[PDB]
């Protein structure tokens, strides 16, 4: 509440939720390049 260090940590918890959203995409798109590279 009073502290201005809680406003600093809220900006980086929106980037941390984006890092969880990005992990599901990156690991799924990387496994699709490994399957298609054995066919290739």
């Amino acid at each position: 509440e009073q502290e201005a260090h809680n406003k600093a940590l809220n900006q980086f918890k929106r980037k941390l939720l984006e890092h969880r959203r990005y992990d599901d995409q990156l690991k799924q798109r990387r496994q699709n390049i490994r399957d298609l590279e054995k066919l290739y």
């Binding site: 260090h5 990387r30 298609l36």
Partner: protein, 61 residues
């Protein structure tokens, strides 16, 4: 507060690696789907019927 400040200083650089790496994989994964359609048009031309029969007397292996 020192432990939480060091988590915050690291994520200023980190969101740049994730953005640059999702763009690399999505353009590479568009090129892998086009490779397997292009080579398959040339396999299907050679697979054309008719074609002789044989058997394999030996695999040298």
């Amino acid at each position: 507060t020192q432990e939480l400040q060091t988590r915050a200083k690291l994520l200023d650089n980190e969101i740049r690696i994730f953005r640059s790496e999702l763009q690399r994989l999505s353009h590479e994964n568009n090129v892998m789907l086009e490779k397997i359609k292009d080579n398959k048009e040339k396999i299907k031309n050679n697979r054309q019927l008719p074609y002789l029969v044989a058997n394999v007397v030996e695999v040298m292996d």
